[PDB]
Design a protein around this nucleic acid. Structure first.
Ligand SMILES: Nc1nc2c(ncn2[C@H]2C[C@H](O)[C@@H](COP(=O)(O)O)O2)c(=O)[nH]1
Ligand SMILES: [Mg+2]
Ligand SMILES: [Zn+2]
Lengths: 158, 263, 14, 83, 1111, 94, 110, 104, 39
DNA sequence: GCATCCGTGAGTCCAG
DNA sequence: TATAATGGGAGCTGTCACGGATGC
């Protein structure tokens, strides 16, 4: 068992799904500029399209693995439960996916790259928002967890 | 009121609070004896009440009394009893303890589930009194005092004291703990195996219950002393005697990581 | 609430 | 009456436990007024006192159990049979 | 060796001086190189000009000057002195009535000086003043959290200069002002300022419903004097409304520039937000006897216009980096200087009343102790003044560029929510989104971007190239965030042919929003990707292939690398490793062209073009703050021709001017018998054999012999009851000789202390009688070596009393410092890491023969477990390994820039060039393929790695181009059943080593009040058995072990004494007793007048004090 | 896992009672110098030194083995405490 | 004097007084040493006769904490002061011979 | 006897005085030259106890043969120094003061 | 932990509190640990 | 009955 | 031990969310 960069297998369905998503995004933009749907509905449709596309490329990664590379190290580690879960493998092989602003509002533009391909500096900076938000969330959550544990210990100790 | 190493003096804030109280009380007694007007006596009694308040619970009412040239409030009795640093939480429900150690942990694949790797020198200091008694039983030292004076210098340590220490720890177990201790499996008892080097060796299967890994974690060691403490550790707290989680019931020590991968 | 202010007020009454 | 964990912990009958949890001055003032006696029922009470907790090997159920070998057992049996 | 660099991005400008945020700040603050008449009103000059004249006799400030340092830096570090310069101030005392002038230059004490690298030396310890981010002063408008259609106007001055003012429209309609927690109608303050109902009705009348709420008839009925008295009664109840007192208070609150200071930045921001011009840095003025408004009416007008919905009025993002500014060393030091100066001025005003009102000089009036105390406080005990992190040069260089949101005048940890810790869209190019502490301080401590620099107003600026039409100029414009929000800024990697944009659609940012835009819409362009990240983050190759959470650790751990004796620069560099060695002064360079005259281990002598012969002394084996050795090795030879800026000596952790934080080792990525289970690491004993990861560490020990009321402490070789073997390595005076090895227990400095008066126990009387030897008057107090420490004595320093040049603190006869150095080899428990966040402890050091090895016999060095890669999503290390394999066989290093680097096809090309060397050498040597290589090729084409049917060589090349090789198990000889990634990786030995952290205690020191053991390894303390460990013991049901923790193993005196004696006698441990800390609790409750009674089952009192406290 | 720990848990209605029994018996063995033991010379727990097999110094090991044999009688109110102590000090002096 | 509660560090978790050991109360090692010293002294004193060991216990104050003069110990045992000084000398001499033979009390000389 | 309960109650001034071994009349701590506790101050050996075991202040009684004896010259009882962790003093207020806990 | 009837004297409340608290740091469209504390 | 103020909490161990 | 002197001075701000008293 080893890991080389070639073990992050980009599936051939990715370019197809991405081109389909671009044509759908253009269809939604054309439906917006004609005043049929509002800015809110357009934003929601774009997010939903990219979410379903992300799930599609996940399934494509794992299907290409199962059928054409059943002993691929990433696939083996994920399936056996040794290490890894589908979303991490997706970020390695499929697309990174949607990111969110510091406000929590999700960006319209997803990160189309994978860690095998490499991100753009702009994609990286967009990712940093969520990474920092999660770090601060954890750092503030451990205190509430510990406090709660001590409350429970003091109420149940006898 | 104590003298530190450098001959300087260190004192408690209660002394300054008591001094304030005694000064204002004596001055009130003198002001009453001299029959001072009511405004002066009133101010003095108000300051006396303020001083009693600052002694019992400083900062509770009004501004906290501080030492000269400092913004740090003085530490009253209430501040002593209450709080995370208070007497209860810091010295009563938890204590620093003797016969304990701490070191960096390392994977111990060769260990059995009931074992852990314990550095020699850690065990030498942790079991030091048992080792002195055993060095007295064997001919290594005339008495306890000579044995301790022999262990005091590292170059005076010969190779029979190590075999004596092996005889000492036989059958006994030590407690390994890793902070934070979230559930009762953050402390577990292991039979120690003396190892060269300065690292604690931890069995892989118990890494999950400790949430331990080898990115630089450290663990604390404790030595149960009495035969009662040893019985409790060996029967109840032994790592191989707790295989299931008390929270769910599912196995806690289970094949994982590299193990699952190979199988 | 402020002992100095209160004592100054007591003083200013004479 | 339903109350959350904090208020229920502060309401416990043992004032040593309650004072060692939170609001130490409030607990201690009401307890000192009431003349409260702590019966040392739970764990925190006995841990503060440095006593042997009433659980596990300290439980009154298992605490007084004795061990004796059949040789000494029968020896004392015959010693008490002759009195 | 060949260094092949990648990337097509051309940086039009180099990185700024990396320590300039410290250097230029302090330089502008002190103005010591400016002749006093040409000094601007800033820094120390501004502090003096603000404090003076002292009006009450009138004492006035003319000028100041700074002298030369009484001692050089090395002397300061040696003697525990502060590197500082004497500050003199020329003041003239003028009697306004007499006309008499008495003018004098008074000495105000010493001001600490910044060294070349941007640090300070305080009491011999190197320290760094960390910049502090905070809200910029000014006028902000934020949505009222209660009422959605209403807003709050905040007027915020500089910290510790005046109060915050809150303007709010209450539900009842009247406008309210909040100052010092007190609220009142703003109409009253407007009436004090001279406004009348006419001026307000015309100025604000455009907005109908609000001005009617503003109107208060009784306020306009009374003239400004009555409104002033009324406002003084509203603000200060109980204080008699004396009109002079009211003018004084309102002036000192709003209009006094001495008590109320908006920033110069705050002034500019108010002028820019409200569209007005400020005559000064105050909210109003006292002119011609009355009050004249400056700020209030424009802010009220903006508030009303924002409430009505008038276009052009916006709420303010308070986390925008245009509303958040940095206070650097100069500003904070100037603040503390200003405080000390104001206290000195209070002392002066107090002196201008007492004594003789006629005979007074500026020397008699000024007391500098307040100023000396304030500066001493700021530098010694402040939170922003930190012990310098100089583990390696990068540690300090990054330390100086730290940005703290904490400290005095800033956030506490509970005051900081998500908004502060967040990465703002304006951190792009200014504050690094990666490098931040991991833990509770995340988002508070941050680091400065690479191309970023802080301007004179305190806002961080980033450079951008101007783009006119489709042509990208080479001129760079440094913008703040607010100015950046105006333009459309394309990305630095956008295609270019010449200076013209070569793409039909470019990626750009409008207010941080990413957008696809035509080259005609492009107003500016990024300088380089480097500008988005910090310096440490820029040292991570293939950073675009690493998840941010692991890149954070890579950055933060490069700070922790230990300088190694054979340290080398990585095979895959980013291009910043040379400039980092340059800007922090680790390495020594040539000032001008010339020829090398002399090369020693101790100095390098260069003869320049000028003909002058310059000698550079080399720092050799000097202990840093953290114990890592600082030492410069000469890299030139006698007679060598050098140019300007050429390297002369390599500093610590550098190789030929490149930053060398670790070593390049041959790594294989595979499981190995569980010895790399869960991030542990397996290493080859060959690493110890060739002294890789071996580092030098020096520890300083110190001892004082002082005067006692019982007699002198003497440092002597004569020590009671000690063998000659124990005193072997001590000289005549008692200090250890240089060069002698010391082990735990050995004596460094012998010392005798007179025993305290003690009546000998009758046992000692009979014992003394038996042996006939008298009891000595002194006692052994010698300084020994702590457990687990030791090494070679490399230096000793002795300082006596009465010898020239030295004076100790009162009572101290002599002080001896012993320096002990050690060569630490790598060992089990030491922590390694790479630049990608892969970190772990060494768990197994195997002999070379067990090590997995290449078919040609080459064993690998490190074995990393692949299971750490997929969860962590840091693939950059994989690419580093591939390129490192190629560079291992081609014998060359690389420069792969961040976000514009070596991409996969080029790495494949280099891998093929490498495979030719790897295999054609074998084929020419007369060797074919191995049988086991055929078996591995079989199992590999079963994996789909190689195409079936090709020759063995072609398939081995197909594997090599994937970075995988055939690997033989040294234990069996049988190969690993699959092809394995092997290549060269850069790995660093971090500062966390088992020798430092291992600790054990049986019994030892106890604390005074609680009688519990101490804590810390240095105090031989015990481990803390906290609340949660007690929970664990209770949940296990182990009552007796818990009772041991509570009583025998701590805090029970009788119990622990009896326990130790029982154990050394072989007896079982006794029943525990009452904990001493419970007795402390009982007595401390009695001190609170609460009676605590321990009762038995008959409710009868039980005495746990055993009759000692009962009469 | 301690030898036969499953059978040892089978013997008792509560594991903590087993712990108490083991600890009290180990104190008995330590006090009387192991010469009150119920083990036959071939059942004695051994320990490998550099010299050879010697008797296991660990009284807890001894106690658990003795418990496995079945020759020990445990329970509550089997004998007054002073009578037990004195009869054991008569059978096995110190 | 300086305050024992002087904060160490930028957190509120440590006080100066927490780094100051207690030098007054004897450590468990010291108490063990003193107890073993008393036990070895009584072991070596039982090698004498009860009368001469008693003269030594009265002379050096191991009984009652007071050191009795020769006239008092002689008036206690009925003998003359020179007789009690002589039996004290012979008891000390037998003790010195026992000590040179056994070497048990040397380690307590520190 | 074995402790089975713990009671907490208010303390009368009589109980406070029955705990007290003496009144602290002077704010002084220890002498600036001899470094010994000042009389009637916060560290007075006459109130709280002896600094060294079984030894009075001036050194007239230095062993356990006198225990419970109070030295006539210096006023110190000869007992174990540990009692300085136990024995309480008191202060007689000229005017009654409210215990802030029962007010605030 | 033993898949058998609990032994009399087991400190159940502490085990319960630890069992509830230990996964707390993992609780993350979802209300999560704030909801746990609300309850 | 509903605002508004005051007071009290806000994870563990290590190392400095 | 005697000219006359007669009301202070420093503040310090970016939580947050409960419980429980005290204000219309
Ligand atoms: N807060 C705190 N600072 C310490 C401690 N020990 C040392 N320091 C400070 C003062 C020293 O100049 C600096 C570094 O010393 P260190 O390498 O022993 O840190 C400690 O225990 N706590
Ligand atoms: Mg870890
Ligand atoms: Zn006396």
């Amino acid at each position: 068992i080893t890991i080389g960069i070639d073990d992050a297998v980009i599936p051939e369905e990715k370019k197809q799904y991405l081109e389909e998503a671009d044509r759908k995004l253009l269809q939604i933009e054309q439906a917006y500029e004609m005043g049929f749907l509002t800015d809110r509905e357009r934003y929601d449709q774009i997010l939903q399209l990219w979410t379903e596309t992300t799930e599609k490329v996940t399934q494509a990664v794992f299907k290409n693995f199962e059928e054409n590379y059943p002993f691929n190290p990433l696939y083996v580690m994920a399936q056996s439960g040794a290490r890894g879960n589908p979303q991490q493998i997706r970020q390695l092989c499929g697309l990174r996916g949607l990111m969110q602003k510091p406000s929590g509002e999700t960006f319209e533009v997803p990160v189309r790259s994978s860690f095998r391909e490499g991100l753009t500096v702009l994609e990286y900076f967009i990712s940093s928002h969520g990474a920092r938000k999660g770090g601060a969330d954890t750092a503030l959550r451990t205190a509430d967890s510990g406090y709660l544990t001590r409350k429970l210990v003091d109420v149940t100790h006898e | 009121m104590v003298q530190v190493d450098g001959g300087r003096f260190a004192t408690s804030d209660l002394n300054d609070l008591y001094r304030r109280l005694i000064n204002r009380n004596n001055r009130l007694k003198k002001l009453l004896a001299q029959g001072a007007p009511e405004i002066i006596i009133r101010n003095e009694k108000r300051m006396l009440q303020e001083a009693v308040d600052a002694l019992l619970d400083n900062g509770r009412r009004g501004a906290p009394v501080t030492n000269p040239g400092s913004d740090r409030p003085l530490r009253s009795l209430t501040d002593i009893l209450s709080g995370k640093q208070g007497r209860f939480r810091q010295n009563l429900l938890g204590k620093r303890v003797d016969y304990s150690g701490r070191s960096v942990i390392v994977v111990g694949p060769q260990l059995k589930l009931h074992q852990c790797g314990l550095p020699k020198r850690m065990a030498l200091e942790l079991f030091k009194p048992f080792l002195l008694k055993k060095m007295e039983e064997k001919g290594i030292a005339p008495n306890v005092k000579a044995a301790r004076r022999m262990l005091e210098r590292q170059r005076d340590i010969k190779d029979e004291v190590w075999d004596a220490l092996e005889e000492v720890i036989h059958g006994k177990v030590v407690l390994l703990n890793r902070a934070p201790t979230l559930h009762r499996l953050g402390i577990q008892a292991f039979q120690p195996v003396l190892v060269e080097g300065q690292s604690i060796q931890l069995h892989p299967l118990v890494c999950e219950a400790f949430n331990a890994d080898f990115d630089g974690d450290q663990m604390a060691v404790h030595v149960p002393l009495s035969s009662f403490a040893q019985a409790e550790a060996r029967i109840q707290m032994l790592s191989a005697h707790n295989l299931l989680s008390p929270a769910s019931g599912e196995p806690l020590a289970k094949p994982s990581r590299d193990i699952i991968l190979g199988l | 609430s402020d002992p100095v202010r209160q004592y100054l007020h007591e003083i200013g009454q004479v | 009456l339903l109350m959350g964990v904090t208020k229920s912990a502060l309401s416990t009958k043992s004032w040593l436990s309650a004072a060692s949890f939170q609001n130490t001055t409030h607990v201690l003032t009401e307890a000192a007024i009431a003349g409260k006696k702590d019966e040392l029922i739970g764990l925190k009470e006995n841990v503060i006192l440095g006593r042997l907790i009433p659980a596990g090997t300290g439980s009154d159920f298992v605490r007084f159990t004795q061990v004796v070998d059949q040789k000494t057992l029968k020896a004392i049996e015959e010693a008490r049979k002759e009195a | 060796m060949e260094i092949k660099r990648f990337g097509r991005i051309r940086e039009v400008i180099p990185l700024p001086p990396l320590t300039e945020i410290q250097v230029e700040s302090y330089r502008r603050a002190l103005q010591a190189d400016v002749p006093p008449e040409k000094r601007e009103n800033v820094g120390i000059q501004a502090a003096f000009r603000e404090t003076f004249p002292i009006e009450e006799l009138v004492l006035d400030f003319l000028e100041y000057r700074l002298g030369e340092p009484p001692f050089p830096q090395d002397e300061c570090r040696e003697k525990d002195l502060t590197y500082q310069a004497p500050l003199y101030a020329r003041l003239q005392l003028i009697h306004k009535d007499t006309g008499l002038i008495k003018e004098d230059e008074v000495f105000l004490g010493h001001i600490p000086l910044m060294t070349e690298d941007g640090s300070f030396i305080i009491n011999g310890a190197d320290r760094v003043i960390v910049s502090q981010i905070h809200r910029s002063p000014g006028v902000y408008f934020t949505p009222d959290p209660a009422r959605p259609g209403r807003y709050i106007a905040s007027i915020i001055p500089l910290p510790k200069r005046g109060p915050w003012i809150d303007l709010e429209v209450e539900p009842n309609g009247v406008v309210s002002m909040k100052v010092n927690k007190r609220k009142f109608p703003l109409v009253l303050l407007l009436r004090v300022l001279g406004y009348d109902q006419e001026t307000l009705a015309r100025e604000l009348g455009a907005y109908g419903e609000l001005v009617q709420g503003l109107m208060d008839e009784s306020v306009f009925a009374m003239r400004p004097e009555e409104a002033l008295i009324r406002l003084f009664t509203l603000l200060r109840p109980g204080d008699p409304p004396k009109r002079d007192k009211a003018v004084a208070y309102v002036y000192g609150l709003i209009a006094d520039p001495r008590r109320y200071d908006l920033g110069e930045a705050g002034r500019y921001k108010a002028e820019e937000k409200l569209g007005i011009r400020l005559s000064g840095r105050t909210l109003a003025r006292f002119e011609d006897g009355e009050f004249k408004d400056e700020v209030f009416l424009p802010t009220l007008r903006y508030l009303f216009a924002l409430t009505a919905g008038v276009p052009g009025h916006e709420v303010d993002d308070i986390d925008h980096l245009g509303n958040r500014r940095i206070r650097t060393v100069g500003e904070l030091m100037t603040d503390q200087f200003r405080v000390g100066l104001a206290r000195l001025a209070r002392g002066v005003r107090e002196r201008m009343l007492m004594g003789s009102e006629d005979s007074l000089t500026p020397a008699k009036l000024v007391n500098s102790r307040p100023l000396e105390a304030a500066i001493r406080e700021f530098f010694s005990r402040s939170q922003l003044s930190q012990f310098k992190d100089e583990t390696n040069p990068l540690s300090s260089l990054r330390h100086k560029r730290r940005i703290s949101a904490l400290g005095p005048g800033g956030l506490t940890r509970e005051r900081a929510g998500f908004d502060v810790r967040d990465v703002h869209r304006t951190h792009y190019g200014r504050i690094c989104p990666v490098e931040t502490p991991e833990g509770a301080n995340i988002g508070l401590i941050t680091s400065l971007a690479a191309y970023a620099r802080v301007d004179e107003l305190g806002f961080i600026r980033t450079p951008y190239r101007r783009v006119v039409g489709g042509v990208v100029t080479d001129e760079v414009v440094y913008m703040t965030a607010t100015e950046e929000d105006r333009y459309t800024i394309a990305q630095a990697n956008t295609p270019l042919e010449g200076n013209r944009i070569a793409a039909e659609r470019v990626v750009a940012r409008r207010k941080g929003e990413p957008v696809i835009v035509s080259p005609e819409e492009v107003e500016f362009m990024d300088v380089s990707p480097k500008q988005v990240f910090s310096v440490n983050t820029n040292l991570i190759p293939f950073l675009e292939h690493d998840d941010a959470n692991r890149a954070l650790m890579g950055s933060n751990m490069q700070t922790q690398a230990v300088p190694l004796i054979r340290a080398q620069a990585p095979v895959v560099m980013t291009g910043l490793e040379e400039r980092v060695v340059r800007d922090s002064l680790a390495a020594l360079y040539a000032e001008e062209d010339g020829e090398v005259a002399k090369v020693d281990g101790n100095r390098i002598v260069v003869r320049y073009e000028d003909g002058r012969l310059v000698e550079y002394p080399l720092r050799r084996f000097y202990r840093s703050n953290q114990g890592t050795a600082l030492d410069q090795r000469p890299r030139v030879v006698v007679g060598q021709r050098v140019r300007k800026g050429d390297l002369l000596a390599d500093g610590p952790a550098s190789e030929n001017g490149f930053l060398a934080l670790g070593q390049n080792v041959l790594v294989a990525i595979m499981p190995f018998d569980g010895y790399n289970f869960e991030d542990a690491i397996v290493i080859s004993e060959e690493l110890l054999k060739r002294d890789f990861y071996t580092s030098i560490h020096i520890e300083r020990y110190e001892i004082e012999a002082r005067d006692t009321k019982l007699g002198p402490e003497r440092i002597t070789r004569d020590i009671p009851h000690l063998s000659e073997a124990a005193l072997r390595d001590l000289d005549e005076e008692g200090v250890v000789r240089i060069g002698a090895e010391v082990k735990p227990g050995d004596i460094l400095v012998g010392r005798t202390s007179f025993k305290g008066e003690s009546e000998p126990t009758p046992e000692e009387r009979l014992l003394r009688s038996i042996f006939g030897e008298k009891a000595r008057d002194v006692k052994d107090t010698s300084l020994r070596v702590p457990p687990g420490e030791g090494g070679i004595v490399v230096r000793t320093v002795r300082l006596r009393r009465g010898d020239p040049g030295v004076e100790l603190k009162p009572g101290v006869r002599e002080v001896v410092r012993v320096y002990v150095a050690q060569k630490r080899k790598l060992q089990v428990g030491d922590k390694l890491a790479n630049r990608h966040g892969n970190k772990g402890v060494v768990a197994k050091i195997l002999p070379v023969e067990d090590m997995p090895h290449l078919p040609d016999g080459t064993p690998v060095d490190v074995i990393l477990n692949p299971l750490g890669v997929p969860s962590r999503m840091n693939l950059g290390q994989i690419l580093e390994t591939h390129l490192g394999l190629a560079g291992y066989f081609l014998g060359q290093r690389y420069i792969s820039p961040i976000f514009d680097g070596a991409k996969e096809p080029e790495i494949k090309e280099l891998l093929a060039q490498a495979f030719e060397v790897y295999f054609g050498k074998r084929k020419g040597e007369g060797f074919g393929v191995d049988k086991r290589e055929v078996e591995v090729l079989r199992r590999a084409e079963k994996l789909g790695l190689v195409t079936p049917g090709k020759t063995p060589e072609e398939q081995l090349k197909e594997l090599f181009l994937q970075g995988k090789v055939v690997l033989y198990d040294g234990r069996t000889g049988e190969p690993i059943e699959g092809p394995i990634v092997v290549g060269q990786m850069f790995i660093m030995k971090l500062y966390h080593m088992v020798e430092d952290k291992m600790h054990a205690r049986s019994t030892g020191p106890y604390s005074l009040i609680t009688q519990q053991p101490l804590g810390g390894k240095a105090q031989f303390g015990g481990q803390r058995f906290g609340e949660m460990e007690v929970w664990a013991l209770e949940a296990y049901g182990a009552a007796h072990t818990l009772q041991e923790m509570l009583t025998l193993k701590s805090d029970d005196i009788e119990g622990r004494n009896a326990a130790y004696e029982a154990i050394i006698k072989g007896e079982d441990v006794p029943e525990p007793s009452v904990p001493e800390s419970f007795r402390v609790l009982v007595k401390e409750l009695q001190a609170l007048a609460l009676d605590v009674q321990t009762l038995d089952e008959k409710d009868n009192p039980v005495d746990i004090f055993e009759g000692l406290a009962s009469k | 896992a301690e030898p036969g720990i499953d059978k040892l848990f089978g013997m008792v209605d509560s594991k903590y009672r087993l712990t108490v029994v083991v600890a009290k018996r180990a104190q008995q063995l330590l006090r009387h110098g192991f010469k009150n033991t119920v083990l036959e010379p071939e059942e004695r727990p051994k320990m490998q030194t550099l010299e050879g097999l010697f008797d296991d110094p660990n009284a807890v090991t001894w106690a658990m083995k003795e418990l496995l044999t079945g020759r020990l009688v445990f329970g509550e109110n089997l004998v007054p405490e002073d009578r037990l102590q004195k009869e054991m000090e008569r059978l096995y002096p110190v | 004097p300086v305050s024992l509660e002087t904060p160490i560090g930028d957190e509120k978790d440590s006080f100066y007084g927490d780094f100051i050991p207690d030098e007054h109360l004897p450590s468990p090692v010291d108490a063990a040493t003193q107890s073993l010293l008393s036990e070895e002294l009584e072991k070596a004193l039982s090698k004498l006769s009860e009368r001469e060991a008693m003269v030594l216990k009265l002379r050096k104050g191991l009984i009652d904490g007071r050191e009795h003069t020769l006239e008092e110990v002689g008036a206690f045992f009925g003998v003359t002061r020179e007789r009690i000084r002589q039996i004290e000398n012979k008891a000390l001499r037998k003790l010195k011979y026992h000590e040179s033979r056994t070497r048990k009390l040397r380690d307590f000389l520190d | 006897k074995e402790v089975r309960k713990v009671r907490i109650a208010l303390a009368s001034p009589e109980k406070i005085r029955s705990w007290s071994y003496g009144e602290v009349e002077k704010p002084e701590t220890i002498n600036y030259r001899t470094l010994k506790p000042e009389r009637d101050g916060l560290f007075d050996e006459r109130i709280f106890g002896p600094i060294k075991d079984y030894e009075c202040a001036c050194g007239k009684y230095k062993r356990q043969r006198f225990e419970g004896k109070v030295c006539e010259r210096c006023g110190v009882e000869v007992t174990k120094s540990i009692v300085r962790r136990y024995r309480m003093g008191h202060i007689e207020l000229a005017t009654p003061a409210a215990h802030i806990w029962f007010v605030k | 932990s033993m898949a058998r009837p609990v032994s009399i004297g087991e400190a159940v409340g502490i085990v319960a509190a630890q069992s509830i608290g230990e996964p707390g740091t993992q609780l993350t469209i979802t209300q999560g640990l704030p909801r746990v504390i609300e309850l």
